[model samples]
Structures are given as C-alpha cells and as structure tokens.
Target: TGIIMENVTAFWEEGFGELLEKVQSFSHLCLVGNPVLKNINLNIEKGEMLAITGSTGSGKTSLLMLILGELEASEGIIKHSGRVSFCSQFSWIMPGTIKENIIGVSYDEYRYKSVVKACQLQQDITKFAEQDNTVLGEGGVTLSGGQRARISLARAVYKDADLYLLDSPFGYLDVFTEEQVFESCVCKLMANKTRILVTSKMEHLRKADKILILHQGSSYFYGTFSELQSLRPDFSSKLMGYDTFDQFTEERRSSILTETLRRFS
Candidate 1:
C-alpha cells in the first residue's frame, strides 16, 4: 500500500497566473475492477470557465470529485492552488428561508444583493409571500428543481472561493432560465475566477472559454469551440441537435438552407 495525499503538494511548483489547477495523465479506477477514467489532462485558469461535456458513463462527475479530493486518482499529477467551492447536481438544502439558504448565518448587504441579482432570483423571490425570507420546505420540497439549483449556486458564489466546481447546476433549468443564469451568474459574476462545469447541454459549448469533450472517461477534445467544430464536424453537428441535414425539422432545415444560400449568393 502507498500513501494517498489529498492536499495538493509540491508547493510553488509550476502553478502561476490565473491558472489555479492542472491535471496531467490522471487515471482512476472503480471498486468493481473497472477503470473509470484514464490518461486525462486538464488546465483550469483564472477567470476562465471550462465546459466539461460527454455522454453518460463518461466519468464527468468522477473527474470533478477527483479534483475536489473526494476521490483519489490512481495515477498521474494533480496540481491545485487556493480555495474550492462545489455545487453538486443535488441541492444540499436545509430548512430555512431563501435568504438563509443562500447567505447562511452571515449577511452582507452589497454581496447579498449582487448575488441575488446574478442568480436571477430577484423576480422569483418577489413572487413569494415573504420574498427571500420565505422558509424552505423539508428537503427543499417547496422549490422547483431550477430554483434549488440556482440557490445552491448562489451559496457557492457568495463564498467567494478561488475555484468553483459546478456539476450541472443548470441541469434542471429551462432554456431561458439556463441562459439567464449562465450569462449573469456563471459568466459575469465569476469573470476573473476559475470554474469547471459539467454539463450535457451542447449549447453551452459555444459559451465556454474552453471545452473538454470526454469519451469513455478520457478527454476526447480540449480546445476552443471553433476548434471542436473543425476537428469533429460531424460530432459538433450532432451536439447541435442534427445528425444530418435531413434530421432537422422542416422549419429549421429551411432556415439553415436559406441562410446558407444567402451567404453564398
């Protein structure tokens, strides 16, 4: 048996800039004698939002847990610096008002307002009888899935951590709400911090500063979205909801064809 260290060691080692974390040649195995992930490489920098996308069973959540030190990688190097805040897919809600859930026992007027706005919770909370003071049900039964997700996110954001690991915080949000939160909260509020997001939604690919497309628990592509389009056009198109041009609905196909003709004409 060998010593397993969770804290990132090798102090002051090549870590610098906004780049807070880097993982190279990392591998991890499951208890059932199966290799869940293998030979992965990643870079998480300051003020950068990275989208981690892949099919089911591709080890997306496993990667996040590994970075958070909840699971140990079987092999390779993991370097990280500063504080980390995590928001899981499941909401860790307690019996409390909306404000309590979000701000916990502490409250800062400026930060609370900013967080509420960024989370797009202002309107929703307004509709409640007591607004932010509305108490949450046991296990967050009163809140919708999207609300739980956002409140969970708001809690993390309020912590002002150097790194954030978001496991599909938008998984339950509608298209408009997802866009609203992603734009106002994830992108703007977290402008200069490092964030790693695990999402199955392909639309988010274009919004990310960088992307990692995973395959069978390994990095299949890591680059800009444009690079992804160029490297795997077919895969890219499929992610955009079209396996083939004919697969598109009539309205969408006509719109695309019309746009294409107009560009060339």
Candidate 2:
C-alpha cells in the first residue's frame, strides 16, 4: 500500500516529548523501536525517487519498515493509498524453476518479460542450461548473492505496485553490477513509479529526487541532493567517508593504480 504522513511524530515510549524536542532543536527526527531508527522526518510524494542514507544503526532500514507499515510508529499519522511491494535486504527464493520464481503463477506474458529484463536476470537464466525451467537446488544454495537480489527485485517489479520500497537491494553487488541493476531495473523500470530506497553509499543518492539523512535517533536533514550539498558542502562525501574532493579523487587514483599494478605483476 502507498503511505502518507501528516504532521507525524514518533519517539520512544520512555520519554516522548523530551526526545522529540531534542530532535527538533537539532533539525533531526527519527522513528525508532525494536527495529530502531534515528531521528527521521520527511514528506514523500508520488512518482518520485527517494533515498535514505545514514551510518549503521542510523535507522535507514527502520524508516523503510515504518513506511511499509511493518513497524508501528510511536506517534504520527501514516496515510496510505494504493498497493506497496517491498524488496527486503534478503531475497526469499522458493524451491522452483527460475521461471516459477519470477512468474509465480502470473500469466501476463508482457509483464513477465519486462520484469526479467529490468532485473537483468534473463542472461543469467539462460546460462543455467535448463533456462527458466532450471530448478533452484536445495534452498538455492547455488545462487550467488547478486542473482538472489535480482530475482527478488524482479518479483517486486512483477507486482506493478504503486509504491516500491527497496532496502539495500545492491548491498552485495560490485560497482558495475550495482549500476546496471539500478539503471535497468530501478531507474528505467520505475521511472514513473513512486519509489523509496535505503542505502549508505553516496553514489546512489544521485538517483533520488529527495534524500533523507537519519542520525542519532532523529531526522537530521531532508531535501534534494543539491539542497543537502548546498547546506553542507561535504554532506554527501562525508557520508561516504570522504571529507574533501581531493581525498575522494586521491583514493580512487590509488585504488586504480594498485589494481593495475597487481594485474600486471
């Protein structure tokens, strides 16, 4: 289901307003609980790409749970409209052929083809020898992390839900693989759909129409990527653990040189 929050406020039960005030003063708000999240507050609109970023335990995942209604807010109103399909951090692959896992009894050929390509699983499926009919052996122990993640993404896209929530879908992928999945599946496939994704990597934030920063159990920043960068010159780079442009460029140069030397040697 789609969700909307109106003047929402979420805080720990121990002492509510006390923490809320602290968040307000610092311009950071969060939604926290068993699946704790640091200060977080933002207004999400339809047909937008939204990204959430924060350090570990910064509540990026927790925020997604709250938006999906899997976790209840301590306070605030979440208004929802339409269907929502979620892609969790882990992909759940049932015992079946790749086709069955992707199609899942759905007979719409057009949608099936679109999702497979969007997730870039078509080539991988072909390599299985058995093609789409190849059965996942024993809980899919043979499938790689990237394979599982793409499969999960295909499933979510197949639903054609109004809202899509993806939590760290590219966590285990290499840079190239991650970009391919994002460009083909997320950027292209969800171009017209409303999507909310959580990731700590700064490179991916560029795809987000808006970015939310969660910190210390509260919402620390909310706005477009440019807006955040404007407010804090090193905001994006800092989150990615680089304090300056020179630092980022130098690191990249060193990494490339090291890799080239290693390959030649």
Candidate 3:
C-alpha cells in the first residue's frame, strides 16, 4: 500500500500536477435576446489559430466581445483559463512612442526586434523621423491605416497573452501587404498561442487552420477549409474566387496559377 501510494504520487507530480491550466472557452453560448449568434460551440487549444468570417451582420464582432466579457450570453457556458489580447478592426493606439506602444515600460531588445521585423515595420520605422522612438499621437493620427493595424497587432503579440483576438487585422492593407503581415507575423511569430481572428475576407479563410462561417447571426458552417469547400462547393467557389470546389484540388486548379501568369505576361 505504501509503494502504491508513492507510485501514484510520483505520477501526479511528473505530469498533471505541474501542467498549465488549459482554457476551454465556449459551449452552446447564446447571447440573450441576441439576433446574431446561437448555440455556438468552440474549443481552442494552445497554439491554434481559428479564423471567423461573416457578412457585416454575421455577429463576428459580437461573438468576440462575448469572449472578452464585454457582452453577456443568454445561455450556455464560457470558460477562459488565460488572458485575452485584442486588436480592434478599428485602430486603438495609445499615445506613446512607437517603441513604447509595442512594449510598455519594460524593454526587451530581442522581442522588440522580432516584433518590428515580423510586423513589417522596419521600413516605416526607418523612414520615420524618430524611427522606433517616434512618439505616436493619440490614436496614431499620423499613421496610415495599415501602419496602425500592424502596430496594434505587434503590441498585442508583444503582450504575450494566452489568446489573441483580432478583428480584421488586415483591413487596411492591400493584398500584397496583407499577405506579408499574415505570413510573417500572425502565422509565424504568434504561432505558439491561440489566435481568433475575425475577418470578412475570403483569402484569409484558406490560411485558417479551422474556420467558422456565420450567417445572419447563427453558425452557418464551422470546420476545416477543405471540409467547407468539399461539403459546400457552390458556396466556397463563389466566396473563394474559384470557379468550383472541385477546382480546389491541386490537379484541377493548376490552371489558376497559369491563368494568373498568362494575364501578367
């Protein structure tokens, strides 16, 4: 009996006892009197990126607010075991030097370099009269929309929060810039934590590890990008700029690249 107890204690100490608390966010959540979302179920584990998209009224923003505790759910449960970092679709920048905005009082040179580079801010920083030390006006008044978005996202990432909530973090950028930021930072630098990005863009959908599509305030579809494309050919094609879901398969879609090249040539 003594040996048995010792072994059991050892097992617990080696594993579960020291494990970080896992976060389970939502299940069957229905915002009270809500006309937007219903019976939505979601489970986001560590290091996963989940993307949500919908039309203007699809409740994307509202759902994020629910997680952020800005709104109440009429039914169901929400469990959050970690801190949330949010970057609004609309820019929210505090008055401070750009460096201060990215990382508050404490400065970590390594992280600062990584954040600035990953966010594609080197050029902007270099071109600015003050570089990273540039004191940003309230709301980053002098910054362009794209600059504000990247800086906001950089600040959030530097926060090192457990989960990131981004609302159309790509909203202000053109296609090329948007692709650069997502590939460099969102997909790589922030890969170690859970990210929930809300957007109406279709290209971001393909890059999402899992996707949620909302329609008129309810769950229209939620699954892997491939699942959505295969299960709903007509819907995916129209939204994704593909002629059909069948063309999504590499073999059939080869012409997509060729046609683009042909046009460019």
lDDT of 3 at 121: 89
- Predict model 1's lDDT versus the native: 0.68
Off by over 4 Å in 3: 1-32, 242-265
lDDT (0 to 1) per candidate: 0.68, 0.66, 0.66
Give the range where candidate 3 is weakest over 10 consecutive residues by summed lDDT. Answer: 1-10
lDDT (0-100) at residue 218 of candidate 1? 60
**Candidate 2: worst-modelled 10 consecutive residues by lDDT:** 21-30
Model 2, residue 125: distance off in Å is 1.2
lDDT of 1 by residue, 1-265 (tens): 0112232222111212112222201212212335556667766667788888765546677677677765556667777777788887777788888888888557999999999999999978989888999888767886787888888889988886778888877655255777788889888887777888877555567889888866665667778999988886666654465454433342454355334323332
Model 2's alpha-carbon lDDT is: 0.66
- Clashing residue pairs for model 1: 18-46, 47-192, 47-193
Task: Please write out the lDDT profile of model 3 over residues 100-132, one tens digit for every residue.
Answer: 888965789898899899999897899978798
Clashes per model (N, Cα, C within 3 A)? 3, 18, 1
Candidate 3: lDDT over CA atoms? 0.66
Q: List the residue pairs that clash in candidate 3.
A: 36-217
In candidate 1 the C-alpha lDDT for residue 138 amounts to: 62
> TM-score for each prediction?
0.78, 0.77, 0.76
